[model samples]
Target: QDINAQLTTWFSQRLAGFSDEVVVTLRSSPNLLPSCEQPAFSMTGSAKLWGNVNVVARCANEKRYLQVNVQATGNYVAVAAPIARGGKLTPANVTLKRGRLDQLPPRTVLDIRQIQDAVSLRDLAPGQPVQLTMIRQAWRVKAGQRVQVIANGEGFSVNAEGQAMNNAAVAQNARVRMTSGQIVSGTVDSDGNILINL
Candidate 1:
């Protein structure tokens, strides 16, 4: 247990900047050391902040690999109630909770503002932390819908009507088939308007 204590202390100091609370536990008890002297500890390049991590220890000219599990806790976004697929996220559906960020899924939402008005791709259960990959912006333009396409260059602007070829969220790519039978793609605006650059 001596080595575990040393590893715990060493990790706590190194991980102080990344988390509010860090709990480190050895995956397996390390073998007893030869000397009472403090061992020099190091980690692999760019070690991650939490989860299962491999650490290297050097003492009395010998090396040992220590596998440790780390938990870093802080406030993260969680679902306040069940949200159906395509349901819009709002203050009432999401809330913050103080817990182990390391235990949550990668890219988990850290701020409520990041998910404001976003729609879930799948149903989410209460108390589940939301990941950015699980949500998307609501569609502003749908396939086969007539939309306004505007082209602008050098203070010259042209406007036309076209049928949208795909559903697109605001600021996303929208393919439009113009009246002249030419297919063009542009960015969709907030009001379902497509802006194409000349």
Candidate 2:
């Protein structure tokens, strides 16, 4: 029990970098733990970042090993209030909640910097966890903007003027309509060019 308690504290402190308000509710075992009488002690390796975190603590004075399994809980960013799609992230709209990041969705918002390039992709309610897929960067292009349509074929390139049918960003898909009433879909390029192959 002493070995388990010490390992739990060690693991909890190690999780400080992963999140705030960390706690390890369960750890270690009596089956494989060293006798807790050795003088020198060190962890075998780093703890696993998420699921099935395996840890090994070694001791000196006859060289004993203590293998511990860790399942921890910690605080992560969450929506504090309702936010609509396209809404920007703000401190007032978000708060920290105690949970496990490894159990949460991938790219979960764990720090303020994570939300720097993110905007809500869908309506989010209070206490909702922020996920990478649920957020998007702001669009660089606006709908109805005049854009140059560049089409290349037969080793030749031509440029035509068109109006964007919908908003998009550089490197994103944009639909445009030429003066001849022909509509085309292609990727938007740097310098705001609509690139298409004819």
Candidate 3:
């Protein structure tokens, strides 16, 4: 399709100036226009925006892709030391670094807000890029722990007990097994109790 060819041309021209290796993935645009026999395109100087990049492909009868998300795969922050499971992250433990972030399956973190009050869910080693899957808000209910399940009604509430089948933080789901051999899922609340819909 002319669309893909023109997109490839525009992306290479805009992103070639970067010092790091850049790979681009294109998402389709629907009903993009200037109807022409041989359409050409143009993009602006700010065509290199990394995430969710938008370029106006003006077809001379033009281009910038309406959306061009170029992969700055060589990036994301890492760690300075080995981190144990359940360990909270601190500035001294984390270090900003760069590497291939998109070539492989990624759980890499790109924003500092993801690190605030974050704890490791599994053991992590030095120089490992901090991952989205590796850290979470400190779990209030760990797997295999006992939790109280409360069933609330419009006018009344009752309590039963179960063993947690998985880890859960406040506002997270934890699968639990009632002593009656019934399995149910509930949400962990602020008080560390599991609340179930009755």
Candidate 4:
């Protein structure tokens, strides 16, 4: 009978057989226009994000309250809404493709950066502890050398032939042992990539 409970029930009935890790949220954006005394239109709210989720309405009027397709960036979710007159905002419905938790690729360091340029650069000598400069302003670290650049970021190509659990296929939510024999668990992203908890 409660609004939130009703909404959850409706969503569950509409979207079944998906992981609960999928997140959904609402958002609003402003629209600006000069010709009219007030802003012509803007988006008010949007539906949450889901994996393998679809939406349908019982009536024609309900169609205007939801949207079908949405996009995502990294872990953040996003939706699209069109503007109309009278400053009215509408709700939109969205569906997401569930990523296969089993097909996630293994995690490997891509490259390493040496913070102090003073370190005379030679062909990245193997078994050397690579140093990196944490870019405080950008909040990103840059690679000091070129190696296998993965989609996520930079680190070293995890030693593939080391005595430390080399050549292991990893999946989302799988536990992996690092070079130091430290074990950790990571979640695979939509792109079949795993981010290790460092």
Which has the greatest lDDT?
A: 1
CA lDDT scores, all candidates in order: 0.80, 0.69, 0.68, 0.26
RMSD of 4: 22.0
| Global Cα RMSD, each model | 13.0, 14.7, 13.1, 22.0
Clashing pairs in 1: none
- The residue ranges of model 1 lying beyond 4 angstroms of the native Cα positions read 13-18, 32-48, 58-64, 101-107, 110-119, 136-198
Tell me the spans in candidate 4 whose CA falls farther than 4 Å from its real position: 1-152, 155-171, 187-198
Clashing pairs in 2: none
State model 2's lDDT: 0.69
Candidate 4 per-residue C-alpha lDDT over 1-198 given as tens digits, one digit per residue, 9 for 90 to 100: 232243344444433443333232222111211222221111222133332223332332222222223221221111123322221111231112233322222221111211111122222322222222211111122222111212233553432211211222222243344445555444433332345432
Q: Return whichever of 2 and 3 wins on lDDT.
A: 2
Quote each prediction's TM-score. 0.48, 0.46, 0.40, 0.19
Tens digit per residue, CA lDDT, model 3, 1-198: 465556555555655533156555556455664456445444445433455466665555245456655565454568778889998888878876765544334556655544666888998888878876888877778888888999896788979999999987766789999999899998887678999765
Return the lDDT, model 1, position 138.
70
Candidate 3 lowest-lDDT run of ten = 40-49
For model 1, where is the 10-residue window of minimal lDDT? Answer: 28-37
Candidate scoring better on lDDT of 2 and 4? 2
